[PDB]
Nucleic acid binder design. Structure first.
Ligand SMILES: [Mg+2]
Length: 439
RNA sequence: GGCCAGGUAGCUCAGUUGGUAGAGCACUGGACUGAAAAUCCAGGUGUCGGCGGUUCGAUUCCGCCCCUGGCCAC
C-alpha cells in the first residue's frame, strides 16, 4: 500500500505557499509516472493535484501568484493555465475529502483508470519521499506494462480505453491481456463517452510519429471502425484497400521523418505551423488525410469521382466528430485534390505538362501543396510503383516547386481584373479590353 | 482560460471559388365547391448578432467584441 528532488518542480513552492497549514496536497497521476519512467520534462507540463482544501480558492490564488489564468469545470475541479511561447503549463486541482485522509487517498487511487496513473506522492515530501501506489503502478512500470486497475473503472468512463492505447504508444509500454480482452468483448463501448473527448484522444494519438501502428491496433479490434463507420466500408472492395490506407499512413510517417529531403525550403518553411484545435498541427490532419485518402472507393466503382465523394464524406466525419471547420475543411480539401500530383506526373511523363496546368495547380491550392506532395509520395510508396514512376513523380514535384519559386511573382469588373492579372504576367490595354468586352 | 458549433422573415430551415437573399411550410386573398377540406394562381421595406478591415461590390474573406449551447482530472 506504500513504498519508499526527483519529483521537484519550481512551481511546487508556489503551491506550498498557497495551501494552508492544516490542509494537505498530493501530486497524482501522469507527472509522477513521467518522472518514474525517467523521461525528460518536455515543453508541455501537466501537474495533477489532490487537496483537502477548496480547490477553486487554491487554484485562483495559485494563478494569482504565477500570473496565469484560472478556470473551474465539472466533482467540481479547478485548473490553472500558464502559457508563453516556449512552454505550456496546466495545473489541475482536485477535491479530496474524508474522515480518514489516508483511506480517502487510497479510495481515490483505486478509482483511477491505470496502475501507472494511480501513483501519488505527498507534496511535503517533494520539496525537502513516501509514495502511495495501492494499485502497484511502479511494479508495472518496472515491467513496462500498462495495466488497468480494474475493468469496471474502464467501463465507468469508456473514453479511458483510448488513453490506454495512446499512453502505451506515448510512453512506450505494452498493454496487458485483460485490456485487449475487454476491447475484444465490446469495442463499441467507446461510443458511450462524449464525442469531442474521443476526437481529442484520437488527435493526441495522431500527434506522435509512430501513430500508424496505433491506428492498426484500433482498426483490427474494431474500435476505429466503431467510431468511424466509414472506415469499415474499405473492406467491401478487394484491391485489400484498408491495408493500402494503413501502409499509406505508415509510409506517410516514414516520409514525414525524412520530409526535409523531399520538399523544398519554402514549402517546409511554414509546414507544421498551422494550429488546429489550439494544441495540434496540420501534420495530424495530414495523417487523417492519408487514412481518408480514399474513403470514396466503396462509394463509386465499376472510381472516377471518388475523390469528390471522398471530400464530402470527410466533411461529414468532421461535422459528426465536431472537428474545427477549418480542420475538417483542410482534410476534405486534402482528400479532394489527393490524386492531383498523380495526374500532373502522368501529364509530365508524356511531356505534355505546360505552365497552364502548373498555374492552375498553384492557383487552385497552394496552401495544401506540401501536404499534397508528401501524401502523393506516400500513396506512390503504398501502391508499389516502379522506380522510374516514383522518380518521375519527384521530378514533377521538383519542376512544380521550381516553377512557383521563380516564374510566379456585374462580373464586368471581375472579368476585367482577371484578364488584367492574366495579361500582366498601360490603360490603353484596359480600354481595348473594354471595347472587346462590349462585343 | 482554451477549443467547437449555432445567431437569417412569425416559427423552423437552404445560401463550399463573393454578384441584386430565394424555396417549402405557416399567413392572407381569389378561382373552384351547397359548404368545407383538397387542388390551382398571386403576395417579402429581413439594420443576415455588433462594430470595423480587404474588395468595384461581403450572408460568404480577415481582425476585435456580444448572446445561446457543447467539451475541458486520472
Ligand atoms: Mg497530468
Amino acid at each position: 500500500x506504500x513504498x519508499x528532488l526527483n519529483f521537484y518542480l519550481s512551481y511546487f513552492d508556489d503551491v506550498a505557499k498557497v495551501l494552508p497549514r492544516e490542509h494537505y496536497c498530493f501530486i497524482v497521476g501522469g507527472w509522477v509516472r513521467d518522472r518514474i519512467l525517467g523521461e525528460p520534462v518536455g515543453y508541455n507540463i501537466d501537474v495533477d493535484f489532490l487537496t483537502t482544501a477548496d480547490p477553486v480558492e487554491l487554484a485562483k490564488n495559485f494563478a494569482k501568484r504565477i500570473g496565469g489564468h484560472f478556470f473551474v469545470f465539472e466533482p467540481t475541479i479547478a485548473s490553472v493555465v500558464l502559457h508563453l511561447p516556449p512552454y505550456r503549463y496546466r495545473f489541475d486541482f482536485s477535491p479530496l475529502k474524508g474522515k480518514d485522509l489516508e483511506k480517502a487517498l487510497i479510495e481515490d487511487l483505486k478509482e483511477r483508470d491505470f496502475t501507472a496513473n494511480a501513483i501519488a506522492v505527498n507534496l511535503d515530501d517533494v520539496l525537502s519521499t513516501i509514495v502511495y501506489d495501492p494499485t502497484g503502478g511502479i511494479k508495472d512500470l518496472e515491467q513496462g506494462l500498462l495495466r488497468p486497475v480494474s475493468i469496471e473503472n474502464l467501463k465507468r468512463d469508456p473514453v479511458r480505453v483510448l488513453r490506454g492505447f495512446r499512453i502505451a504508444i506515448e510512453k512506450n509500454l505494452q498493454l496487458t491481456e485483460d485490456f485487449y480482452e475487454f476491447v475484444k468483448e465490446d469495442p463499441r463501448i467507446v461510443l458511450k463517452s462524449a464525442v469531442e473527448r474521443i476526437t481529442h484522444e484520437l488527435f493526441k494519438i495522431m500527434k506522435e510519429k509512430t501513430a500508424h501502428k496505433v491506428i492498426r491496433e484500433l482498426y483490427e479490434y474494431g474500435v476505429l471502425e466503431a467510431i468511424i463507420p466509414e472506415i469499415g466500408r474499405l473492406r467491401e472492395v478487394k484491391d485489400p484497400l484498408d491495408e493500402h490506407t494503413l501502409k499509406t499512413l505508415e509510409y506517410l510517417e516514414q516520409v514525414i521523418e525524412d520530409r526535409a529531403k523531399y520538399l523544398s525550403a519554402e514549402l517546409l518553411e511554414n509546414f507544421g505551423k498551422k494550429r488546429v484545435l489550439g494544441e495540434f498541427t496540420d501534420v495530424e490532419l495530414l495523417k487523417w488525410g492519408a487514412l481518408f485518402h480514399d474513403i470514396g472507393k466503396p462509394q463509386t466503382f465499376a472510381f472516377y469521382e471518388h475523390d469528390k465523394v471522398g471530400a464530402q464524406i470527410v466533411r461529414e466525419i468532421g461535422e459528426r466528430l465536431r472537428w474545427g471547420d477549418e480542420a475538417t475543411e483542410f482534410v476534405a480539401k486534402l482528400v479532394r485534390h489527393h490524386l492531383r500530383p498523380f495526374f500532373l506526373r502522368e501529364a509530365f511523363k508524356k511531356g505534355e505538362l505546360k505552365r497552364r496546368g502548373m498555374a492552375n495547380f498553384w492557383r487552385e491550392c497552394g496552401d495544401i501543396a506540401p501536404h499534397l506532395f508528401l501524401l502523393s509520395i506516400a500513396d506512390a510508396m503504398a501502391s508499389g510503383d516502379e522506380e522510374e514512376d516514383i522518380k518521375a513523380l519527384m521530378e514533377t514535384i521538383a519542376e512544380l516547386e521550381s516553377f512557383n519559386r521563380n516564374e510566379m511573382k456585374x462580373x464586368x469588373x471581375x472579368x476585367x481584373x482577371x484578364x488584367x492579372x492574366x495579361x500582366x504576367x498601360x490603360x490603353x490595354x484596359x480600354x481595348x479590353x473594354x471595347x472587346x468586352x462590349x462585343x
